[PDB]
Amino acid sequence: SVTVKRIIDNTVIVPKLPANEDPVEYPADYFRKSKEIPLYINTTKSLSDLRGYVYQGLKSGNVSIIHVNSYLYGALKDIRGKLDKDWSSFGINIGKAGDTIGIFDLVSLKALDGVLPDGVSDASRTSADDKWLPLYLLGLYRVGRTQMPEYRKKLMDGLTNQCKMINEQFEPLVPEGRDIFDVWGNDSNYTKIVAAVDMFFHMFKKHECASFRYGTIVSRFKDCAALATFGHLCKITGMSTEDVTTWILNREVADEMVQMMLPGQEIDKADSYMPYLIDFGLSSKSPYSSVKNPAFHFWGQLTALLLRSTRARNARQPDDIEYTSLTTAGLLYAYAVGSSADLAQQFCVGDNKYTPTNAPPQGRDVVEWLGWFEDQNRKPTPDMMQYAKRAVMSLQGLREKTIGKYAKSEFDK
Amino acid sequence: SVTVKRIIDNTVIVPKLPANEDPVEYPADYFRKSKEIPLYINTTKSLSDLRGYVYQGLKSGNVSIIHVNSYLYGALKDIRGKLDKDWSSFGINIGKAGDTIGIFDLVSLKALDGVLPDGVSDASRTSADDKWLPLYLLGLYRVGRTQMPEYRKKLMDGLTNQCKMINEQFEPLVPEGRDIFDVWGNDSNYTKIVAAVDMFFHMFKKHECASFRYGTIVSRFKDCAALATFGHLCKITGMSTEDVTTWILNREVADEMVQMMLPGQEIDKADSYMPYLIDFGLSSKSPYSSVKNPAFHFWGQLTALLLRSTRARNARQPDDIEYTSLTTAGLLYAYAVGSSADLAQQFCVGDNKYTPDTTNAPPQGRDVVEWLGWFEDQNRKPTPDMMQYAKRAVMSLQGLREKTIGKYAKSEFDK
Amino acid sequence: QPDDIEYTSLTTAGLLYAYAVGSSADLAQQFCVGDNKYTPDLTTNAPP
């Protein structure tokens, strides 16, 4: 309808509305540009000194990020780990047959000049060093993300991990909520380390120091929720990835989906850079984010909730999506799966069972159901509605703006 | 459906999703590699000394794990126990033919150099030693696992055991919750001892010192819940292991099942290493874990709950499994067993009852094929009676923790 | 809620729009494996 007229007086009106942008950036379409991920670990002073500046700065309540980065690079240059097979991603050849490589085999540059305290702090601290201090530093990245009292839930375990080797304790005193170290995650060089460590131990899963993954793990697939919800949807319906796809029933979810499955981005790859696209700063607007995949995110999570997901009662409810239709589509999917059990004899002793109008389709086929739905005047039947109710009533403790609370308001009146 | 097209514009889309790994590691496929389980009991200083470092470190509130390990090895080298028959597992020939063997006949190496306090602590403590001190040390392993106030439930008994010989008391002061000794379980060498002790006294069940099993027992079958739930399922339905198997009714439970019954792993063996696969570090991802057998675990426990298990009302409800179908399948199994009593005259006095004598009346016995068929007939949708059966099984359950399959079951069936 | 507007009629109009959208789901098969559903299949007071 490129053209709209106003009947009263036959004049043309041209409906337009404000431009929105934030186009996503994929990982591949970046190793076009550069062919290395720069890590500006700056000053290169003694490790013995650095061990000091931190152990102090920590117990103090302030310590330069610049210093901790440097210290980490210091204690982590263990060139440990022998390449099982080969290893390469996005064209970059990280290692090869038999090779021996270490964490920072992901691209070091140095820079700047200014620092803090002079040359050499309090010698008091020894090689109660690599062992555990880095783990702490990395640990805090995780803790620095959660905005809620749950943080002290993590820090608890964050140190009851800790206690292995020397049995220390707290370091700051100030809660968090953003101010303390909670802002380390804002340092493009810090994150790049967290990512390189996680990516590294994800490969050498088995390694004395692979414990460092604690707290370094929440960087893998950071800002890639949609991919995860899609995964859960398959696991939770029992359907194949291609079958689940066909159950997508509204354009902007298909749009979203097409956007996520763009090829040559290595998402199905074992150990690639793709999962850390954010923390290595490969991309500044993730294509796989839940906010750039709102329709999908809603549909997927709502459906999973009707199918009994616990994960899903707390998902966030996106804004500016087409709720009514998105949820009708979800209901149907959920109803189909919900009433047709896979159910098929699996083992035997010489005697198998050969399985040989408004009653709804037998299996889980989109076409059978779409058609049955037409037959129903494309309006949810009372049974579906009943199904929904028995899935949402008896849910308690629901945070607002969750699609749990949305679902319960919609179905359990 | 290797191929998916988008109708509006006939372009191909290739649905893919993130790779997951954690492949399991079986015990056997390990005694391929090594042929011994290394136990790095390090420093080898006087026992008299060690008895000290701990009795102190304990009353103190800190003591090196390294020390306690060493102490244990010290007081436990009782080479007690005479082999009843023969004994071997996974190729390793542990003993033979009337041999005499002791706990640490499972592979000692020494290592490192650094320690703590000098040469010789407080002589104050004597051979109120072997008797009871080791038991305490081992006892703590158990206590160190439970994350809940139940811990002081165990420690209570953990010492009201204790009281035998000497009548002592508490040692730390600080509760638990991970920090105190609750982290000993993280010491690959500590666990190896716990396992070796348990596996040893499980063989010499009858032995003055076999009391040490207290608290060393929760290492046996550690991280093998699925195997246990399968055992309970049989016991709780009355069915044989092979008949229970046939009642599996969804792929990913069969998958799971097949994974657990992989052959030559010695799971049905009397005294093998298999039960301790985790604490001897034979495997770092158990094939029998409840988390690597989620579908089975759910199905098995839900079914048992419908059949009146108490154990099962508190099992954990796994994530990322196919609930609806998993529970339809469970219901059916539970309904079949639930309505068809074994019921058969067993003793007599010359006069037996020979059992000899519709449509929607459901099958007579407990046969998968009869029922599957009957279920087809029912439009593969649970009938009102089944539904009623479920309700009367879950209503009147009270005190349900969230994320348990007890609470799941009650929400699904007792509206 | 603005003042000095024609509420009753403004909301009748809103209801209708909401009802239309609210009952007619977009709903259309989007992906497939060689078998699409061609939509090709109350006459009076059944709404559009």
CSV table of N, CA and C in Angstrom, one decimal, chain A residues 69-123:
chain,number,residue,atom,x,y,z
A,69,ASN,N,45.4,-6.5,35.1
A,69,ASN,CA,45.6,-7.1,33.7
A,69,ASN,C,47.0,-7.5,33.6
A,70,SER,N,48.0,-6.6,33.9
A,70,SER,CA,49.4,-6.9,33.8
A,70,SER,C,49.8,-8.1,34.6
A,71,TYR,N,49.4,-8.1,35.9
A,71,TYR,CA,49.6,-9.3,36.7
A,71,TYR,C,49.1,-10.6,36.2
A,72,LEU,N,47.9,-10.6,35.7
A,72,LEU,CA,47.3,-11.8,35.1
A,72,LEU,C,48.2,-12.2,33.9
A,73,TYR,N,48.4,-11.4,33.0
A,73,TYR,CA,49.3,-11.7,31.9
A,73,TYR,C,50.6,-12.4,32.4
A,74,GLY,N,51.0,-11.8,33.6
A,74,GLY,CA,52.2,-12.3,34.2
A,74,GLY,C,52.1,-13.7,34.7
A,75,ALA,N,51.2,-14.0,35.6
A,75,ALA,CA,51.0,-15.4,36.1
A,75,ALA,C,50.4,-16.4,35.2
A,76,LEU,N,49.9,-16.0,34.0
A,76,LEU,CA,49.2,-16.9,33.2
A,76,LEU,C,50.0,-17.3,31.9
A,77,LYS,N,51.2,-16.8,31.8
A,77,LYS,CA,52.0,-17.2,30.6
A,77,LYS,C,52.5,-18.6,30.6
A,78,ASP,N,52.1,-19.4,31.5
A,78,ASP,CA,52.1,-20.9,31.4
A,78,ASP,C,51.7,-21.2,29.9
A,79,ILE,N,52.7,-21.7,29.2
A,79,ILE,CA,52.5,-22.1,27.8
A,79,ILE,C,52.1,-23.6,27.8
A,80,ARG,N,51.2,-23.9,28.7
A,80,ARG,CA,50.8,-25.3,28.9
A,80,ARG,C,49.9,-25.8,27.8
A,81,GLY,N,49.6,-27.1,27.8
A,81,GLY,CA,48.7,-27.7,26.8
A,81,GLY,C,49.2,-28.1,25.4
A,82,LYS,N,49.1,-29.3,25.1
A,82,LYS,CA,49.6,-29.9,23.8
A,82,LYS,C,48.4,-30.2,22.9
A,83,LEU,N,48.4,-29.6,21.7
A,83,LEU,CA,47.3,-29.7,20.7
A,83,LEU,C,47.0,-31.2,20.4
A,84,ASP,N,45.8,-31.6,20.9
A,84,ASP,CA,45.3,-32.9,20.5
A,84,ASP,C,45.3,-33.2,19.0
A,85,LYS,N,44.4,-32.5,18.3
A,85,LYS,CA,44.3,-32.5,16.8
A,85,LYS,C,44.9,-31.2,16.3
A,86,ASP,N,44.2,-30.7,15.3
A,86,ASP,CA,44.6,-29.3,14.8
A,86,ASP,C,43.7,-28.3,15.4
A,87,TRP,N,43.9,-27.0,15.1
A,87,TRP,CA,43.0,-25.9,15.7
A,87,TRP,C,43.0,-24.7,14.8
A,88,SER,N,41.9,-24.3,14.3
A,88,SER,CA,41.8,-23.0,13.6
A,88,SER,C,40.3,-22.5,13.5
A,89,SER,N,40.2,-21.2,13.4
A,89,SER,CA,38.9,-20.6,13.4
A,89,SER,C,38.9,-19.4,12.5
A,90,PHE,N,37.9,-19.2,11.7
A,90,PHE,CA,37.7,-18.0,10.9
A,90,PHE,C,38.9,-17.7,10.1
A,91,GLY,N,39.7,-18.7,9.6
A,91,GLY,CA,40.9,-18.5,8.9
A,91,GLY,C,42.2,-18.4,9.7
A,92,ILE,N,42.1,-17.8,10.9
A,92,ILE,CA,43.2,-17.8,11.8
A,92,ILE,C,43.7,-19.2,12.2
A,93,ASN,N,44.9,-19.5,11.9
A,93,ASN,CA,45.5,-20.8,12.4
A,93,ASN,C,46.2,-20.7,13.7
A,94,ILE,N,45.4,-21.1,14.8
A,94,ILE,CA,45.9,-20.9,16.1
A,94,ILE,C,47.0,-21.8,16.5
A,95,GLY,N,46.9,-23.0,16.1
A,95,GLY,CA,48.0,-24.0,16.4
A,95,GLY,C,48.0,-25.1,15.4
A,96,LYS,N,48.8,-26.1,15.5
A,96,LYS,CA,48.8,-27.2,14.5
A,96,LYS,C,49.4,-28.5,15.0
A,97,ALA,N,49.1,-29.6,14.3
A,97,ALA,CA,49.6,-30.9,14.7
A,97,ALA,C,50.6,-30.8,15.8
A,98,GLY,N,50.4,-31.4,17.0
A,98,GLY,CA,51.4,-31.7,17.9
A,98,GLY,C,51.8,-30.5,18.7
A,99,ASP,N,51.5,-29.3,18.2
A,99,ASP,CA,52.1,-28.1,18.7
A,99,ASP,C,51.9,-27.9,20.2
A,100,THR,N,52.7,-27.1,20.8
A,100,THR,CA,52.5,-26.7,22.2
A,100,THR,C,52.1,-25.2,22.2
A,101,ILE,N,51.0,-24.9,22.8
A,101,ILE,CA,50.6,-23.5,22.8
A,101,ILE,C,50.1,-23.1,24.2
A,102,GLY,N,50.0,-21.8,24.5
A,102,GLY,CA,49.5,-21.2,25.7
A,102,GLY,C,48.4,-20.2,25.5
A,103,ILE,N,47.7,-19.9,26.6
A,103,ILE,CA,46.6,-19.0,26.6
A,103,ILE,C,46.8,-17.8,25.6
A,104,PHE,N,47.8,-17.1,25.9
A,104,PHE,CA,48.0,-15.8,25.1
A,104,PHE,C,48.4,-16.0,23.7
A,105,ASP,N,48.2,-17.2,23.2
A,105,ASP,CA,48.4,-17.4,21.8
A,105,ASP,C,47.2,-16.8,21.0
A,106,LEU,N,46.8,-15.7,21.5
A,106,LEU,CA,45.7,-14.8,20.9
A,106,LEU,C,46.0,-13.3,21.0
A,107,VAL,N,47.3,-13.0,20.6
A,107,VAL,CA,47.7,-11.7,19.9
A,107,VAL,C,48.1,-10.4,20.7
A,108,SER,N,49.3,-10.5,21.4
A,108,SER,CA,49.7,-9.5,22.4
A,108,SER,C,50.4,-8.2,21.8
A,109,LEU,N,49.8,-7.0,22.1
A,109,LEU,CA,50.4,-5.7,21.9
A,109,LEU,C,50.6,-5.0,23.2
A,110,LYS,N,51.5,-4.1,23.3
A,110,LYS,CA,51.8,-3.3,24.5
A,110,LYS,C,51.4,-1.8,24.3
A,111,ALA,N,51.2,-1.0,25.3
A,111,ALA,CA,50.9,0.4,25.1
A,111,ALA,C,51.0,1.3,26.3
A,112,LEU,N,50.7,2.6,26.1
A,112,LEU,CA,50.7,3.6,27.1
A,112,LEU,C,52.0,3.7,27.9
A,113,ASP,N,52.0,4.5,29.0
A,113,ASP,CA,53.2,4.8,29.8
A,113,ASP,C,52.9,5.0,31.3
A,114,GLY,N,51.7,5.7,31.6
A,114,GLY,CA,51.4,6.0,33.0
A,114,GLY,C,50.9,4.9,33.9
A,115,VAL,N,51.4,4.9,35.1
A,115,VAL,CA,51.0,3.9,36.1
A,115,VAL,C,50.6,4.5,37.5
A,116,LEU,N,50.9,3.8,38.5
A,116,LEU,CA,50.5,4.2,39.9
A,116,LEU,C,51.7,4.1,40.9
A,117,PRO,N,51.6,3.5,42.1
A,117,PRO,CA,52.7,3.4,43.0
A,117,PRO,C,54.1,3.1,42.3
A,118,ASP,N,55.2,3.5,42.9
A,118,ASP,CA,56.5,3.4,42.3
A,118,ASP,C,57.1,1.9,42.3
A,119,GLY,N,57.8,1.6,41.2
A,119,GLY,CA,58.6,0.4,41.0
A,119,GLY,C,58.3,-0.9,41.8
A,120,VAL,N,58.3,-0.8,43.1
A,120,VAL,CA,58.3,-2.0,44.0
A,120,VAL,C,57.5,-1.9,45.3
A,121,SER,N,56.4,-2.5,45.4
A,121,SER,CA,55.5,-2.4,46.6
A,121,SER,C,56.1,-3.2,47.8
A,122,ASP,N,55.1,-3.8,48.5
A,122,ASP,CA,55.4,-4.7,49.7
A,122,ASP,C,55.8,-6.1,49.4
A,123,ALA,N,57.1,-6.4,49.5
A,123,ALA,CA,57.6,-7.7,49.2
A,123,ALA,C,56.9,-8.9,49.9
